[PDB]
Structure formats: C-alpha cells, structure tokens
Amino acid sequence: MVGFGELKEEWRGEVVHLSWSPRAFLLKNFLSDEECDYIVEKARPKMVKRTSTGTWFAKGEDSVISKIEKRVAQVTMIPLENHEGLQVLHYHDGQKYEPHYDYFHDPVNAGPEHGGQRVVTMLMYLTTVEEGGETVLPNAEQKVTGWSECAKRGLAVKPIKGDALMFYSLKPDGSNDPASLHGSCPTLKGDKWSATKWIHVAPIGG
Ligand SMILES: [Cl-]
Numbered sequence: 001m002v003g004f005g006e007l008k009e010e011w012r013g014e015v016v017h018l019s020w021s022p023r024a025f026l027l028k029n030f031l032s033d034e035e036c037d038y039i040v041e042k043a044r045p046k047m048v049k050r051t052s053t054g055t056w057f058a059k060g061e062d063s064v065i066s067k068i069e070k071r072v073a074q075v076t077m078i079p080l081e082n083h084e085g086l087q088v089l090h091y092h093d094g095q096k097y098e099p100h101y102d103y104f105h106d107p108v109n110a111g112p113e114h115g116g117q118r119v120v121t122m123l124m125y126l127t128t129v130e131e132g133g134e135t136v137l138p139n140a141e142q143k144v145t146g147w148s149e150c151a152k153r154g155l156a157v158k159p160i161k162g163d164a165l166m167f168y169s170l171k172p173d174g175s176n177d178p179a180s181l182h183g184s185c186p187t188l189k190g191d192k193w194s195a196t197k198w199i200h201v202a203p204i205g206g
Pocket of ligand 1: 123134135136183184194
C-alpha cells in the first residue's frame with residue numbers, strides 16, 4: 001500500500017463543493033451499497049464501546065477495502081503512504097460526537113513518524129440515517145437552515161449511504177484550520193455507521 005494502485009476503474013461520480021472555509025467536498029456515491037454493507041458486516045463482530053462503538057481496519061488489510069483505499073488515494077491525489085487505515089464507528093439512540101478537530105490543537109505534536117499533521121479527513125457514510133445524525137461543522141462560513149437543531153449550528157451533511165464527506169483540516173500553508181472543527185449530531189432514529197479515512201501531510205512510519 002504505497003503510491004496510488006492500478007488506474008482501473010477510477011471513480012468518476014458527482015463532486016459537490018460545499019464550502020471554502022473549511023475546504024469541503026461532498027462526493028456523491030463514493031462507495032457502492034455493496035461496499036457499505038461489506039464494511040458494516042466485517043466491522044460488526046469486531047465492535048467495542050462521544051459514546052459509540054468502533055473498530056479499525058489496518059490499511060490494506062482486506063482486498064475489498066483496499067480497493068476503496070486506492071480510490072481515496074486517487075481522488076485526493078495523496079499517496080497511500082500518507083494514509084491511516086479505516087476507522088469504523090457505529091452510532092444509535094442519542095449517540096454523537098461533540099464538535100472537535102482532527103489535528104493536534106498544537107502542531108508541534110505531530111511528528112515525522114506520524115506523517116505530520118492530518119490534512120484530509122474523508123468521512124464515508126455506510127448507512128442512510130433515518131432521523132438526525134448529520135455531520136456538523138460549527139465554525140463553517142455558512143450554516144444550513146431548511147435538519148435537526150444540532151445541524152443548524154453549522155454546515156451539515158446528511159448521512160446518505162455511499163456518499164463521502166471530504167474536508168481539509170489544514171490551510172494551504174499547512175497551519176491549522178479551526179474551521180474544520182466537526183461533530184456528529186445525535187442520531188435520533190436508528191443507525192449511523194460511518195467510516196473515517198485520515199490522510200497526513202507526509203508519509204507515516206517516517
Ligand atoms: Cl460525522
């Protein structure tokens with residue numbers, strides 16, 4: 001798992017530019033329904049108990065997920081050596097994640113072995129959630145209003161199965177973008193499964 005993998009059959013779906021601050025895109029149908037289900041089924045027997053339950057897949061652990069990992073590498077244009085594995089979270093019944101940052105809220109804390117600061121987060125929605133559950137970004141320039149109360153606190157994205165949210169947590173010059181602060185709104189009914197892909201500015205392992 002270095003570089004970008006084979007060029008077949010690169011993803012060519014709709015890309016919606018959501019926001020300048022932070023820099024965020026929604027990728028429509030980034031994953032197939034099959035892929036979403038595959039991940040949930042593989043994750044489930046491994047889950048342990050923000051309050052929700054989570055598990056990890058090592059980068060490249062699994063050939064189905066590896067294909068997605070290569071997809072991510074190619075759409076972001078950032079080589080796989082800069083990527084962590086796949087973290088899968090499951091939420092239900094009020095469960096959530098208070099708005100937070102992905103970067104060290106002091107940048108001297110991310111060293112060469114971690115690959116420096118996290119630059120891109122790609123949030124992959126593995127289920128469509130039913131009520132609430134929006135990803136919220138409170139510090140965003142523009143807020144939604146047309147949507148749980150929680151969501152009206154920033155820019156929000158609805159978790160629709162197969163969509164992915166992609167956003168930058170560093171500014172172009174490499175400084176922290178406090179606009180990338182983000183949380184998961186209470187999920188109100190019934191199941192939020194998401195997978196997170198974090199990508200670093202430099203390669204991990206050094
Ligand atoms: Cl989220």
